[PDB]
Design a protein around this ligand. Structure first.
Ligand SMILES: [Mg+2]
Ligand SMILES: [Mg+2]
Ligand SMILES: [Mg+2]
Ligand SMILES: [Mg+2]
Ligand SMILES: [Mg+2]
Ligand SMILES: [Mg+2]
Ligand SMILES: [Mg+2]
Ligand SMILES: [Mg+2]
Ligand SMILES: [Mg+2]
Ligand SMILES: [Mg+2]
Ligand SMILES: [Mg+2]
Ligand SMILES: [Mg+2]
Ligand SMILES: [Mg+2]
Ligand SMILES: [Mg+2]
Ligand SMILES: [Mg+2]
Ligand SMILES: [Mg+2]
Ligand SMILES: [Mg+2]
Ligand SMILES: [Mg+2]
Ligand SMILES: [Mg+2]
Ligand SMILES: [Mg+2]
Ligand SMILES: [Mg+2]
Ligand SMILES: [Mg+2]
Ligand SMILES: [Mg+2]
Ligand SMILES: [Mg+2]
Ligand SMILES: [Mg+2]
Ligand SMILES: [Mg+2]
Ligand SMILES: [Mg+2]
Ligand SMILES: [Mg+2]
Ligand SMILES: [Mg+2]
Ligand SMILES: [Mg+2]
Ligand SMILES: [Mg+2]
Ligand SMILES: [Mg+2]
Ligand SMILES: [Mg+2]
Ligand SMILES: [Mg+2]
Ligand SMILES: [Mg+2]
Ligand SMILES: [Mg+2]
Ligand SMILES: [Mg+2]
Ligand SMILES: [Mg+2]
Ligand SMILES: [Mg+2]
Ligand SMILES: [Mg+2]
Ligand SMILES: [Mg+2]
Ligand SMILES: [Mg+2]
Ligand SMILES: [Mg+2]
Ligand SMILES: [Mg+2]
Ligand SMILES: [Mg+2]
Ligand SMILES: [Mg+2]
Ligand SMILES: [Mg+2]
Ligand SMILES: [Mg+2]
Ligand SMILES: [Mg+2]
Ligand SMILES: [Zn+2]
Lengths: 69, 181, 73, 117
RNA sequence: CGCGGGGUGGAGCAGCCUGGUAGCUCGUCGGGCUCAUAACCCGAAGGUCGUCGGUUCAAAUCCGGCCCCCGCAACCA
RNA sequence: CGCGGGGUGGAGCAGCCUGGUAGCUCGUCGGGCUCAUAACCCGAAGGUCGUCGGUUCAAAUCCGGCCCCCGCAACCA
RNA sequence: UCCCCCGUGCCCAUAGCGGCGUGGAACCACCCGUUCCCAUUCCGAACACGGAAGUGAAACGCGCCAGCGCCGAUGGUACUGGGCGGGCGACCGCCUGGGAGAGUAGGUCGGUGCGGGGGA
RNA sequence: GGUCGCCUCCUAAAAGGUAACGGAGGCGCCCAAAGGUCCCCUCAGGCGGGACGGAAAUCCGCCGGAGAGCGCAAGGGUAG
RNA sequence: AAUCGCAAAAAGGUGGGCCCAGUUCGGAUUGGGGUCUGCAACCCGACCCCAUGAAGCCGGAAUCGCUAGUAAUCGCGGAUCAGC
């Protein structure tokens, strides 16, 4: 290591947007996170989020009938 | 060495799982990382101020090591670019400093991006390498709001001993790399 | 597609030539050659009088042309 | 970046701040306040992290937002344009959809004035 | 053929000597004035620079070949 | 080689008296009047005073050196 | 003296590419560590040091095939130093001495010198 | 009209040399680093990978004996 | 129907928020979901809710209105007419 121009590597606590205490190292000691691996939709399985099957559209709109045959 | 969750996840889980899948007859035949190379292709500050010298600070902030400069191979007129004139930053991450990157990237950084839908699986090299792009550098938590004056992306490149993408896809998917399909 | 086309202050075209290319063109424009009279109150009318005027038009078919391949000893 | 899709204007109030998310208007802004019980007129930064994290996920999961919302909107125009409905041909040719007069105006679908002789 | 000059928006002419950068007047187009036209007033469009090549990081600019135009020369017998 | 005197904004420029005052015209911008183009009248921007360095309480005004263009007359084996 | 490894020359691909297997006692390499010497236009990759836990995966060593590459006769011709011949002429032709290139047959997955370490 | 000295190639017939108003190009400079030395590094190009980024800007991989480079013309030389 | 209803006049006053930003300015455009009238709203209706939130930061040459309850500004009503 050409020490004299490189930043420190202090042990970093990382409190995330889920109560996570992600134990690792970093340049900044106390950094907080919005989302991590532990709660992202495209990370932990297929998940759901808001999107279920794309609105009521379109062959399943329902809200009407007039057939009995 | 160093207590790093990723360094552990590889050895104490991923590595033997790789042997489970493909079955090697030597301990070294098992695929592993070696380099992680980041390349902000700035070049915007070509004949302009060393505005890139701040981007160096940003980059080092993420890696824990200073990036060197890259300069113009040939000269190109269309690009308003004279040969030798500086246009980019490269920082290579080997050994322990590498792990700390991925351990932060895969955990914190990646999901914090705009509409993450999982890494593109087609983006695989051939002889066992994987490359991707970032447009924003504030994605990493070490980067704050006022630390940024413009969005500067980067060409993350990670290499492996793998013979092919099969091992590579396998190696990374077990590590913490999401995929689309 | 027009070729020569001298204007006419307002409106016109005081003279205008045009290559109308295609098929059966000369066949249906053959009979146009001649004088076409017009009776109306013109745009240019200083009061309210109907004025007779005229315009000769000339349809000429496509002429396959060829100059002599220069001289000959 | 930050909650929800990207960071919201930390200078002004929170009820306004939400608007600046591609998914929320002043309407859903009011609602996001009520179904979280947070102070309406307090500035963004002034919000304790306690207040923040609760409202963080609430809105992410309730409606479509940002590129996620944009996704559906994009997807909508696709299927119209493919089935070949009138409302789709109007998208296809980039003209106004909701039945307006084209002989004048309708510039916002046409862009700048394409004047020719 | 021998020497010199030239070809750039529809017309006429700069820019080439010194490489990075297309300019002037007229015309044309759109909008004014006027009853209308012109004048006038406001705004815009419009050429990849004859042509093949080569030099160069880059050519209207430099270099070579050809095409076209223009002037000069073509004498002693 | 030697003599002569100059950049002051975007060009022309007295200020170069006799060291404490950085101006005029055009240019450009805003306003005025205006059939106008325009003359015309008010306001505005831009001066680092060729450079380093020295004297002075203070100097574009004085010196030392030097950059540079013009100007001067010689010389040219 | 015979085999194996290490360092090193020589011949300058018949030695190379590629494929295939093999070798860790020794030797070597990777390898382990980054305190010190030394080092990175960043990185212990390289270079450097201290090591010796693993391993022959890679590199390398050793064999194995002939796809590529490379080598490549014999025979014959072209051409030609010298000596002549024919035809009006343009060009042909003979004796004598020398003799390719291409192509065919075929060869090749090395040979070897010095030194060191270890085997029978 | 063209040319006049110098350089590169061909003409030139495998030593040197060799003419023509024979065929083709260059020179009248440049560099205080483009020089001395020690030390390290190896091209152009091709395919695949890569935010803005393209035919080509910087980055990764694999391929590559010299087709790049060596201030400028050409030849020779040149990565041992 | 001077009885009942359309009918809240809107500017205004008071209170609270906004802080000079393409903004809580602006509401064009578009997505999705519905109400009404009609046989029937695809071409081709009006209104409601959500999301989208464009051009536009005072407009070249030029040009218009109006001299007192007028100009400017703020609403309301009606004729037409199922509806707009
Ligand atoms: Mg684990
Ligand atoms: Mg590799
Ligand atoms: Mg005429
Ligand atoms: Mg005529
Ligand atoms: Mg012309
Ligand atoms: Mg008129
Ligand atoms: Mg046009
Ligand atoms: Mg055109
Ligand atoms: Mg050319
Ligand atoms: Mg060219
Ligand atoms: Mg020539
Ligand atoms: Mg001037
Ligand atoms: Mg003093
Ligand atoms: Mg002074
Ligand atoms: Mg002069
Ligand atoms: Mg003995
Ligand atoms: Mg085999
Ligand atoms: Mg083995
Ligand atoms: Mg084996
Ligand atoms: Mg064994
Ligand atoms: Mg061993
Ligand atoms: Mg042992
Ligand atoms: Mg190695
Ligand atoms: Mg041991
Ligand atoms: Mg061992
Ligand atoms: Mg064998
Ligand atoms: Mg023979
Ligand atoms: Mg004979
Ligand atoms: Mg005969
Ligand atoms: Mg004859
Ligand atoms: Mg003959
Ligand atoms: Mg003959
Ligand atoms: Mg003959
Ligand atoms: Mg013979
Ligand atoms: Mg042989
Ligand atoms: Mg002469
Ligand atoms: Mg020769
Ligand atoms: Mg010869
Ligand atoms: Mg000699
Ligand atoms: Mg390369
Ligand atoms: Mg390459
Ligand atoms: Mg590519
Ligand atoms: Mg292109
Ligand atoms: Mg070679
Ligand atoms: Mg040259
Ligand atoms: Mg050469
Ligand atoms: Mg009020
Ligand atoms: Mg609307
Ligand atoms: Mg304004
Ligand atoms: Zn988290």
């Amino acid at each position: 290591m050409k020490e004299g121009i490189h930043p420190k590597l202090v042990p970093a606590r990382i409190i995330c947007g889920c109560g996570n205490v992600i134990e690792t190292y970093s340049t900044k000691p106390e950094i907080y996170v919005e989302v991590c691996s532990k709660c992202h939709p495209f990370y932990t399985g297929q998940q759901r989020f808001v999107d279920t099957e794309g609105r009521v559209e379109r062959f399943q709109r329902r809200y009407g009938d007039s057939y009995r045959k | 060495p160093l207590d790093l969750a990723l360094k552990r996840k590889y050895y104490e889980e991923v590595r033997p799982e790789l042997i489970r899948r493909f079955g090697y007859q030597n301990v070294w035949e098992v695929p592993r990382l070696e380099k992680v190379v980041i390349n902000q292709g700035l070049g915007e500050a070509k004949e302009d101020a060393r505005i890139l010298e701040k981007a160096a600070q940003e980059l080092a902030l993420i890696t824990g090591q200073k990036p060197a400069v890259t300069r113009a191979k040939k000269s190109i007129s269309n690009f308003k670019l004279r040969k030798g004139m500086p246009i980019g930053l490269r920082v290579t991450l080997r050994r322990d400093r590498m792990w700390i990157f991925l351990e932060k990237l895969l955990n914190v950084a990646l999901p914090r991006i705009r509409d993450f839908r999982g890494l593109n699986p087609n983006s695989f090299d051939g002889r066992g390498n994987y490359n991707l792009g970032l447009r924003e550098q504030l994605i990493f938590p070490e980067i704050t709001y006022d630390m940024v004056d413009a969005l500067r992306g980067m060409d993350i490149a990670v290499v492996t001993t793998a013979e092919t993408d099969e091992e590579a896809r396998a190696l990374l998917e077990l590590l913490g790399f999401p995929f689309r399909k | 597609e027009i070729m020569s086309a001298s204007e006419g202050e307002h409106g016109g075209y005081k003279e205008i030539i045009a290559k109308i290319s295609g098929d059966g063109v000369y066949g249906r424009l053959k009979f146009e050659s001649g004088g076409h009279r017009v009776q109306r109150v013109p745009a240019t009318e200083s009061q309210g009088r109907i004025h007779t005027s005229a315009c000769t038009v000339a349809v000429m078919p496509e002429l396959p042309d060829a100059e002599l391949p220069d001289i000959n000893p | 970046a930050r909650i929800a899709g990207v960071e919201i204007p930390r200078n002004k109030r929170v009820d306004v701040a939400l608007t600046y998310i591609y998914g929320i208007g002043k309407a859903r802004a009011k609602e996001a306040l009520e179904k979280t019980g947070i102070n309406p007129a307090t500035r963004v930064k002034d919000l304790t992290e306690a207040e923040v994290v609760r409202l963080r996920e609430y809105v992410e999961n309730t409606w479509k937002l940002e590129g996620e919302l944009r996704a559906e909107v994009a997807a909508n125009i696709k299927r119209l344009m493919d089935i070949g409905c009138y409302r789709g041909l109007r998208h296809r040719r980039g003209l106004p959809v909701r039945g307006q007069r084209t002989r004048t105006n309708a510039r916002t679908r046409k862009g700048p004035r394409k004047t020719v002789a």
